[model samples]
Target: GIPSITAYSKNGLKIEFTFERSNTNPSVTVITIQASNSTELDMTDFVFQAAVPKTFQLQLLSPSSSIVPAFNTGTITQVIKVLNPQKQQLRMRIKLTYNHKGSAMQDLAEVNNFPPQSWQ
Candidate 1:
């Protein structure tokens, strides 16, 4: 099953976390990062970090693109593969860093509301 989860950051970027149960690995949850920006600020050097409880592990792949075009011109896509060996409730702490409007900024957020179907 696929789970719909989204997090909106006040720091000018929005992150949508779509989850899917792995086809071949039941213990794994495939996460898609759908990022967007609506302001006139293009984001460069886009980077992110993901964290989980000790019972789980995470793998972050390179983004589809590093430059998040301004004014909703484009989308930034990335993937995070997580292993939930204990079938615990899904939770994540994410940190984002990017260059926006000639300055570097960062934001941190936590997602703990993933639908149960995503991990079961």
Candidate 2:
């Protein structure tokens, strides 16, 4: 099931997300985010402040590993900021990776539409 999507603001930061799962097989999930000039977010040069023309990756740890699927209904309010205001005209891509004991823990989920502001 997917959780309801909610919004929160604190310390000049705003976050919005839908709760997916609360009890994933594994208790941990890792996400990597990178920004690029292209809409596809293929080149990661925007992730770093340096002007060098190279790709970069930023790692983010979610508070929980268990995710409710996109259809379940649940609500959780947590104050976490995933973006920096310093960047502009940036295209972001998020890769969610998780692992479970039954399998070799290597999976990826790409966020197609993000930075929720564009949605509304």
Candidate 3:
């Protein structure tokens, strides 16, 4: 298991992605996204996207749910798989979009804080 990264938080909403070494494929790192909303507005039509260097390959899976309930009532999780054959330092550019209180929103984050062991 690898440590989790907090992508961003605003207006009582937070997004974090955690990394895990793959059991079936050592070259593949499995990442999970947790979306938590502490406000009363529900997050709808949630989507997550990530970008890695050309040396890496990625697979994004369907999220557990498209909506995150409000006031910490629920948390949404999404999965992403990355293959880092070159074993280079890992960095991720992530983008998320969702609707809150009938207002559409989008956020971006750059993560370069993964522990060195995460590349292994």
Candidate 4:
């Protein structure tokens, strides 16, 4: 099974990401990663960057962070930063994978359509 998105903080901190349906469109999806610090770090130095693939349409929706759109794929890596280590609902779109049972159901239905009197 493939994941829709993968992310981690560079400062050895931690984060929690959950799948959420976009309000604009149900088809559209994004994961939410709440900002948090693993170690007992004072609010100061509670900052780090998230390195993710360019494929992720990363967008910042939080306390104080953003990734300006880049001109090229390999250009300066756009990142989602953490500030104050609070909850940050960052999001990104990624590769989609469907279950095998779905395709198998369709295939079985197709076979029924092609037969003269197929019933099961």
Off by over 4 Å in 3: none
Candidate 1 structure, TM-score to reference: 0.91
Tens-digit lDDT string for candidate 4 (38-118): 333222312223333343333444434222112211111222322212222322222211122123111110101111111
* Candidate 2 lDDT, 1-120, residue by residue in tens: 333332222222223454321133221112222211212112111111111112322333433223312222332222222232333322333332222223323222223333423211
What's the lDDT for residue 70 in model 1?
Answer: 85
**Error in Å for residue 61 of model 4:** 1.7
Clashes of 3: 0
Candidate lDDT (C-alpha), each: 0.84, 0.26, 0.84, 0.29
Please identify model 1 stretches exceeding 4 Å from their true place. none
Worst 10 residues of 1 by lDDT: 3-12
Rank list by TM-score? 1, 3, 4, 2
**TM-score-better candidate, 2 vs 3:** 3
- Count backbone overlaps in model 4: 0
Q: Once superposed on the true structure, which residue ranges of model 2 sit more than 4 Å away at CA?
A: 1-62, 65-80, 84-90, 115-120
lDDT value for model 3: 0.84
Q: Residue 103 of model 4: what lDDT?
A: 30
Find the 10 residues in a row with the least total lDDT in model 4.
105-114
Candidate 2: which pairs clash? 1-71, 1-72, 2-70, 2-71, 2-72, 20-67, 20-68, 20-69, 21-67, 21-68
